Amino acid sequence: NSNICEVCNKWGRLFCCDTCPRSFHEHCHIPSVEANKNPWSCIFCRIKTIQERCPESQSGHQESEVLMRQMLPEEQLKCEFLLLKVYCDSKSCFFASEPYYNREGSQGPQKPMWLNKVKTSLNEQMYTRVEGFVQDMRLIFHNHKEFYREDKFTRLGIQVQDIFEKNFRNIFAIQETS
Numbered sequence: 001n002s003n004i005c006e007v008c009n010k011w012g013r014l015f016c017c018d019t020c021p022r023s024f025h026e027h028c029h030i031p032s033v034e035a036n037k038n039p040w041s042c043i044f045c046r047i048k049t050i051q052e053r054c055p056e057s058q059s060g061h062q063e064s065e066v067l068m069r070q071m072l073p074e075e076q077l078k079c080e081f082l083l084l085k086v087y088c089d090s091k092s093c094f095f096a097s098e099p100y101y102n103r104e105g106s107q108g109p110q111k112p113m114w115l116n117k118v119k120t121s122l123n124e125q126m127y128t129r130v131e132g133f134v135q136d137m138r139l140i141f142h143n144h145k146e147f148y149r150e151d152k153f154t155r156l157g158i159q160v161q162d163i164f165e166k167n168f169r170n171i172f173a174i175q176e177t178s
Protein backbone atom coordinates (compact mmCIF):
# COMPACT_ATOMS: atom_id res chain seq x y z
CA ASN A 1 0.00 0.00 0.00
CA SER A 2 0.93 3.68 -0.46
CA ASN A 3 2.10 5.52 2.75
CA ILE A 4 0.23 8.75 1.99
CA CYS A 5 -3.55 9.50 1.64
CA GLU A 6 -4.60 9.38 -1.99
CA VAL A 7 -6.76 12.55 -1.60
CA CYS A 8 -4.71 15.00 0.53
CA ASN A 9 -1.20 13.47 0.00
CA LYS A 10 -0.36 13.51 3.75
CA TRP A 11 0.58 10.66 6.09
CA GLY A 12 -1.34 9.96 9.25
CA ARG A 13 -3.93 7.34 10.36
CA LEU A 14 -4.54 5.63 6.99
CA PHE A 15 -6.97 2.85 5.98
CA CYS A 16 -5.60 0.66 3.24
CA CYS A 17 -7.55 -0.71 0.26
CA ASP A 18 -7.51 -4.52 -0.02
CA THR A 19 -7.82 -4.61 -3.78
CA CYS A 20 -5.46 -1.84 -4.84
CA PRO A 21 -2.44 -0.02 -3.29
CA ARG A 22 -4.24 3.22 -2.33
CA SER A 23 -4.66 4.49 1.17
CA PHE A 24 -6.99 7.03 2.86
CA HIS A 25 -7.67 9.13 5.80
CA GLU A 26 -11.04 8.16 7.27
CA HIS A 27 -12.85 11.42 6.25
CA CYS A 28 -10.82 11.90 3.02
CA HIS A 29 -12.46 8.78 1.52
CA ILE A 30 -16.01 9.30 0.30
CA PRO A 31 -18.07 7.69 1.70
CA SER A 32 -16.01 7.87 5.07
CA VAL A 33 -14.04 4.59 5.48
CA GLU A 34 -16.43 1.87 6.66
CA ALA A 35 -16.02 0.56 10.30
CA ASN A 36 -15.62 -3.13 9.57
CA LYS A 37 -15.64 -4.90 6.12
CA ASN A 38 -12.62 -7.18 5.60
CA PRO A 39 -11.66 -7.13 2.83
CA TRP A 40 -12.40 -3.41 2.21
CA SER A 41 -12.36 -2.02 -1.33
CA CYS A 42 -11.97 1.79 -1.97
CA ILE A 43 -14.18 3.91 -4.20
CA PHE A 44 -11.66 3.67 -7.06
CA CYS A 45 -12.00 -0.11 -6.94
CA ARG A 46 -15.83 0.02 -6.70
CA ILE A 47 -16.02 2.29 -9.73
CA LYS A 48 -13.70 0.00 -11.74
CA THR A 49 -16.01 -2.99 -10.91
CA ILE A 50 -19.11 -1.19 -12.30
CA GLN A 51 -17.28 -0.61 -15.58
CA GLU A 52 -16.05 -4.25 -15.68
CA ARG A 53 -19.50 -5.69 -14.97
CA CYS A 54 -21.04 -3.52 -17.77
CA PRO A 55 -18.45 -2.64 -20.41
CA GLU A 56 -21.09 -0.84 -22.51
CA SER A 57 -21.46 1.71 -19.65
CA GLN A 58 -18.36 3.38 -21.21
CA SER A 59 -20.07 4.13 -24.50
CA GLY A 60 -20.79 7.86 -24.97
CA HIS A 61 -23.77 9.49 -23.27
CA GLN A 62 -25.56 12.81 -23.55
CA GLU A 63 -25.19 15.09 -20.51
CA SER A 64 -28.89 15.79 -20.55
CA GLU A 65 -29.71 12.13 -20.08
CA VAL A 66 -27.06 11.72 -17.35
CA LEU A 67 -28.47 14.64 -15.34
CA MET A 68 -32.01 13.19 -15.33
CA ARG A 69 -30.88 9.92 -13.84
CA GLN A 70 -32.28 9.05 -10.48
CA MET A 71 -29.77 8.62 -7.64
CA LEU A 72 -29.86 4.81 -7.45
CA PRO A 73 -26.78 3.17 -5.79
CA GLU A 74 -24.52 3.26 -8.86
CA GLU A 75 -25.21 6.95 -9.59
CA GLN A 76 -24.79 7.81 -5.88
CA LEU A 77 -21.38 6.14 -6.06
CA LYS A 78 -20.38 7.91 -9.22
CA CYS A 79 -21.24 11.32 -7.66
CA GLU A 80 -19.29 10.42 -4.50
CA PHE A 81 -16.26 9.58 -6.65
CA LEU A 82 -16.60 12.78 -8.70
CA LEU A 83 -16.73 14.78 -5.44
CA LEU A 84 -13.65 12.92 -4.26
CA LYS A 85 -11.78 13.71 -7.46
CA VAL A 86 -12.32 17.39 -6.73
CA TYR A 87 -11.00 17.11 -3.19
CA CYS A 88 -7.95 15.39 -4.72
CA ASP A 89 -6.82 18.74 -6.09
CA SER A 90 -5.14 20.89 -3.47
CA LYS A 91 -6.96 24.00 -4.74
CA SER A 92 -10.18 22.46 -3.38
CA CYS A 93 -9.19 23.99 -0.05
CA PHE A 94 -10.62 27.26 -1.16
CA PHE A 95 -14.07 25.79 -1.78
CA ALA A 96 -14.25 23.21 1.08
CA SER A 97 -15.69 25.11 3.99
CA GLU A 98 -18.41 27.76 4.40
CA PRO A 99 -17.41 31.01 2.72
CA TYR A 100 -18.17 34.58 3.75
CA TYR A 101 -18.42 37.67 1.65
CA ASN A 102 -17.20 41.19 2.58
CA ARG A 103 -15.39 42.83 -0.33
CA GLU A 104 -15.73 46.44 -1.43
CA GLY A 105 -17.73 46.59 -4.66
CA SER A 106 -19.18 43.05 -4.50
CA GLN A 107 -22.23 41.51 -2.95
CA GLY A 108 -22.29 37.86 -1.76
CA PRO A 109 -24.22 35.19 -3.67
CA GLN A 110 -27.89 34.53 -3.03
CA LYS A 111 -27.20 30.83 -2.52
CA PRO A 112 -23.81 30.08 -1.04
CA MET A 113 -22.39 26.60 -1.62
CA TRP A 114 -19.32 24.69 -0.66
CA LEU A 115 -17.77 21.20 -0.94
CA ASN A 116 -18.43 20.06 2.61
CA LYS A 117 -22.13 21.04 2.21
CA VAL A 118 -22.29 18.89 -0.98
CA LYS A 119 -20.54 16.11 0.92
CA THR A 120 -23.15 16.25 3.73
CA SER A 121 -25.99 16.43 1.22
CA LEU A 122 -24.73 13.25 -0.49
CA ASN A 123 -24.26 11.48 2.82
CA GLU A 124 -27.82 12.40 3.91
CA GLN A 125 -29.26 11.20 0.47
CA MET A 126 -30.67 14.67 -0.26
CA TYR A 127 -30.21 14.46 -4.02
CA THR A 128 -32.86 12.51 -5.95
CA ARG A 129 -31.22 12.98 -9.36
CA VAL A 130 -27.68 13.46 -10.67
CA GLU A 131 -28.81 16.97 -11.74
CA GLY A 132 -29.10 18.10 -8.04
CA PHE A 133 -25.54 17.21 -7.31
CA VAL A 134 -24.10 18.67 -10.53
CA GLN A 135 -26.08 21.93 -10.07
CA ASP A 136 -24.67 22.46 -6.56
CA MET A 137 -21.15 21.68 -7.75
CA ARG A 138 -21.32 24.12 -10.65
CA LEU A 139 -22.88 26.74 -8.30
CA ILE A 140 -19.72 26.71 -6.14
CA PHE A 141 -17.62 27.93 -9.06
CA HIS A 142 -20.24 30.27 -10.53
CA ASN A 143 -20.60 32.06 -7.11
CA HIS A 144 -16.82 32.46 -6.93
CA LYS A 145 -16.58 33.94 -10.45
CA GLU A 146 -19.32 36.43 -9.84
CA PHE A 147 -18.04 37.56 -6.41
CA TYR A 148 -14.36 38.00 -7.35
CA ARG A 149 -15.12 39.92 -10.55
CA GLU A 150 -11.83 41.08 -12.05
CA ASP A 151 -9.59 39.98 -9.19
CA LYS A 152 -7.12 37.41 -10.43
CA PHE A 153 -8.39 35.13 -7.60
CA THR A 154 -11.30 34.37 -9.91
CA ARG A 155 -8.91 31.99 -11.70
CA LEU A 156 -9.02 29.51 -8.82
CA GLY A 157 -12.76 28.89 -9.65
CA ILE A 158 -11.94 28.33 -13.32
CA GLN A 159 -9.23 25.91 -12.39
CA VAL A 160 -11.18 23.78 -9.96
CA GLN A 161 -14.26 23.82 -12.26
CA ASP A 162 -12.09 22.43 -15.02
CA ILE A 163 -11.12 19.49 -12.73
CA PHE A 164 -14.77 18.92 -11.94
CA GLU A 165 -15.88 19.02 -15.60
CA LYS A 166 -13.10 16.71 -16.93
CA ASN A 167 -13.85 14.20 -14.23
CA PHE A 168 -17.64 14.48 -14.82
CA ARG A 169 -17.09 13.70 -18.54
CA ASN A 170 -14.83 10.69 -17.59
CA ILE A 171 -16.89 9.14 -14.81
CA PHE A 172 -20.24 9.45 -16.58
CA ALA A 173 -18.77 8.61 -20.02
CA ILE A 174 -20.05 11.71 -21.67
CA GLN A 175 -19.79 11.49 -25.50
CA GLU A 176 -16.69 13.21 -26.75
CA THR A 177 -17.16 16.31 -28.92
CA SER A 178 -15.16 19.07 -30.66
Ligand SMILES: [Zn+2]
Nearest residue numbers: 005008025028
Ligand atom coordinates in the same frame (compact mmCIF):
# COMPACT_ATOMS: atom_id res chain seq x y z
ZN1 LIG B 1 -6.27 12.60 3.50
Ligand SMILES: [Zn+2]
Nearest residue numbers: 017020042045
Ligand atom coordinates in the same frame (compact mmCIF):
# COMPACT_ATOMS: atom_id res chain seq x y z
ZN1 LIG C 1 -8.82 0.33 -4.10
Ligand SMILES: [Zn+2]
Nearest residue numbers: 053054055056
Ligand atom coordinates in the same frame (compact mmCIF):
# COMPACT_ATOMS: atom_id res chain seq x y z
ZN1 LIG D 1 -23.82 -6.02 -19.10
